[PDB]
Amino acid sequence: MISYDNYVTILDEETLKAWIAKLEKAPVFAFDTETDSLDNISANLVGLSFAIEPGVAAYIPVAHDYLDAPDQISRERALELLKPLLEDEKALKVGQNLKYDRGILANYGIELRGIAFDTMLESYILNSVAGRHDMDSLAERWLKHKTITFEEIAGKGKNQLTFNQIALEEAGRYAAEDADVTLQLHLKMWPDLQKHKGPLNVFENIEMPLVPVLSRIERNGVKIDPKVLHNHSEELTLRLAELEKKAHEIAGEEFNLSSTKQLQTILFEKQGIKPLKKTPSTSEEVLEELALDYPLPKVILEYRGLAKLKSTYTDKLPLMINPKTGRVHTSYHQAVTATGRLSSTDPNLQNIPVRNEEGRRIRQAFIAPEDYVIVSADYSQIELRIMAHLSRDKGLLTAFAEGKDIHRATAAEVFGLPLETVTSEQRRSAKAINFGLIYGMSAFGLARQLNIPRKEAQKYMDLYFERYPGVLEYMERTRAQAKEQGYVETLDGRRLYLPDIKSSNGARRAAAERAAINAPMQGTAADIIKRAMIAVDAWLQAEQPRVRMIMQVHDELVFEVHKDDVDAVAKQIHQLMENCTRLDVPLLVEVGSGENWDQAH
Ligand SMILES: [Mg+2]
Ligand SMILES: [Zn+2]
Ligand SMILES: [Zn+2]
Ligand SMILES: [Zn+2]
C-alpha cells in the first residue's frame, strides 16, 4: 500500500526550490500534473508531481480548496518558480501521456519543452498489441505493482470528487505514485527500446515529436455550425417519417424497420429468397442486392443508415461544442491501433460517411471562421502507392509515375485493353482487386464484394499476379518473415507483432496472415502521416503563418487558412507533405479549399 510516508507533500517555497535544484541536475525526471477535469482547454491545474529517482517523488498541491484545506504554495507562484525548468528543452522529462500535461501548462502560457519520454508511447512502440498502454496496465505488467486508481481517491459515478476536493495527503499518494511509477516504467522500457534500431527510430522521430503537435491540434479544435446540424436533424426527422410511410405503402400495414423480426415476414413472404440481411455485413448484404429491383429493401436500407447518422453526428455533435472556445475538441489516441494509425473519438471523425451525401452534409457543418477557409491536404491512395513501392512493381510504379488512374491502369492490364477504353465496370473490378490486396483478401472475398462467382474472381486474381508478379512476391515474402520472426515492419521500422502467425487455429492464423500483408502498408501510411504533421507543425511553429492544423482523418490533414494566404500556404503545405517525409514512396498530395470541410474535401 502507498501511505503518507512514501512521498513528500511540498507546502513551502523553500522546499519547492530545493526540489527544483535537484531536478535541474537530474539526468531525466518524471513529471505529472493533476487537474479538476479531463477537459484539457477548461481544466484548472490543481497540483504537480515529480520523481527524481525510483521511490523519491513529491506532490506540490496548489489549488485544493475543500473546507479547511491547509495553506499551499499558490498556483501562480509554483508555476513561476517551475516555469524555467519546464520550458528548458535541455531538462528532459518523462511522463505517461505527456500530451495531456503539455496542454494543461499551455493554459498558463507555459510551453513544456524537453518532452523526451512518454511511457505510454514507449510501451506502444515496444509492442502495440501487448495489451493496454495506460499506466495501471503498464505498472501491473512491467512492475508487478497495482497502482492507486483515480476512482480509489475520487470515488465513482455522479458523486465523484474533482481533484481539488481531495485531501492533500490522499492526492499526494496518487500523484506522487504516478510520477514514481512513470519513472520506474521508463527505467525498465527505455533500455529495452534499444535492442532494435527500428522501433527506436519510430519512437524517437515519429511518436515523441508528435506529442506536442497532437496537443495543439486537439486544443485548436474545429468550428462546427450547430444551426446547420440542427436543420439537418429536423430534416432527417421528416425524411425518416416519410420513409416509414414509403415502406408501409410498398407493403401493407405498419411494421418496424428491423430485419429477422418484421422484414423477413414482408420481404420474403411477397417473394425473395429466405436469408435475411445482417447489419458478415460488408460481405453479403441481402437488402442491397434486392435494391436493384425490389423497392422495399431499398427504403429500409436508406432508412436505417439515416437513423444511425442522425443520432451519431447530427444529434451528438452540437452537444460537443466546448462553451469556453465555442469549438469541438476531438480526442486523438496515439497508442491504440495495432498498425500505428491515429484513432479518434468524440467525435470519431473517421466514421463520418465518406462516399455518401449525408456524410457530405455532416462535413458541411465543419466550417471556417470569418475571413478563413478550410484547406484539405490529402495523400492520394497512399496505401496503394506504398504497395507499389513494397512490391518493386515497375507496372504500378510507372502507372503512378505518369499520373494515370491506377485502377484503370490495373484494369487495362488485367483485362488487356487500352486505358482510354476501360469501362466503369472494369475499373470497379480492378479497384476491388487492388484494395483487396491491401487487406489481404481471398479470391472468394473478392467475389463477395464484386458480385461475381468464385473462381471467376480467382481468374481476375491470377491475371493480376501474372501482370503484376511483384505483388505476389511481396505477399509471399511478407507472410514468410512473419512466420520466421513473429512480426512485420513498416518502412520506418515500426513493428506489428503477430502471435497467431502459427496459431494452428485456421481462422486466427488466417487473420494473422492478413495482418501480415496489411500492416506494412497501413503502418507505413501512418508513419508518413505523422511525419507530415510533425513537419507542417514545425513550419507553423517557426513561421507563425495565419493557419491552424485542425484535424487528421484517414490520409488527410485539415487546416484553417486565412483567405488572403491560401495560395502561398497551399504551396507550402503541399511541398512539406510530399517532399519532407519519405523520399522513397511516390507520394502525391491533393490540396483543396472551401468555406467548409465538405467544399475543401
Ligand atoms: Mg497525468
Ligand atoms: Zn497523475
Ligand atoms: Zn488510406
Ligand atoms: Zn507536388
CATH class (in words) of the domain with range 220-331: mainly alpha
Nearest ligand by distance to the CA of 575: 4
Cα 31 to ligand 1 centre (Å): 8
Cα 380 to ligand 4 centre (Å): 12
Cα 529 to ligand 3 centre (Å): 10
CB atoms within 10 A of CB 447: 20
Cα 403 to ligand 4 centre (Å): 12
CATH 3.30.420.10 fits 3-219, yes or no: yes
Task: Judge contact between 10 and 73, C-beta under 8 A.
Answer: yes
Q: Provide the resolution (angstroms).
A: 2.1
Greatest CA separation for the chain? 85
Cα 117 to ligand 4 centre (Å): 34
Which residues, chain by chain, have CB under 5 Å from ion ligand 2? 32, 178
Cα 464 to ligand 4 centre (Å): 29
Cα 418 to ligand 3 centre (Å): 28
Cα 578 to ligand 4 centre (Å): 7
Cα 113 to ligand 2 centre (Å): 19
Nearest ligand by distance to the CA of 572: 4
Cα 267 to ligand 1 centre (Å): 55
Task: Judge contact between 506 and 356, C-beta under 8 A.
Answer: no
Task: Judge contact between 135 and 178, C-beta under 8 A.
Answer: yes
CA distance 254 to 167: 60
Which among 72, 48, 45 has a CA at the least distance from the CA of 179? 48
- Retrieve residue 459's grid coordinates: 481468374
User: Using what technique was this structure determined?
Assistant: X-ray
* Domain boundaries along the sequence of the chain: 3-219, 220-331, 332-381+526-600, 382-525
> 364-380 b/e with 16+ CB inside 10 Å = b?
bbbbbeeebbbbbbbbe
Find how far residue 568's CA is from the centre of its chain.
29
Nearest ligand by distance to the CA of 34: 2
DSSP class of residue 146 equals P
- Retrieve residue 186's grid coordinates: 521508463
Long-range contacts of 293-297 (CB under 8 A, 24+ apart): 294/267, 295/250, 296/247, 296/250, 296/251, 296/266, 296/267, 297/263, 297/267
Cα 552 to ligand 3 centre (Å): 12
**382-525 in CATH: which number?**
1.10.150.20
Cα 33 to ligand 2 centre (Å): 6
Cα 169 to ligand 1 centre (Å): 17
Nearest ligand by distance to the CA of 104: 1
CATH class (in words) of the domain with range 332-381+526-600: alpha beta
Nearest ligand by distance to the CA of 591: 4
Cα 592 to ligand 4 centre (Å): 13
- Retrieve residue 184's grid coordinates: 520506474
Cα 39 to ligand 1 centre (Å): 13
Task: Judge contact between 445 and 283, C-beta under 8 A.
Answer: yes
Cα 35 to ligand 1 centre (Å): 9
21, containing H or E segment: helix 13-25
Task: Judge contact between 347 and 218, C-beta under 8 A.
Answer: no
DSSP class of residue 263 equals S
Q: How far is CA 471 from CA 398, 440, 480, 527, in A?
A: 14, 11, 14, 22
Identity (one letter) of the amino acid at 466?
E
Nearest ligand by distance to the CA of 101: 1
Helix axes 424-438, 382-390, angle to 10 degrees: 70
C-alpha atoms less than 13 angstroms from C-alpha of 132 in its C-beta half-sphere: 7
Cα 161 to ligand 3 centre (Å): 42
DSSP class of residue 2 equals -
CB atoms within 10 A of CB 551: 23
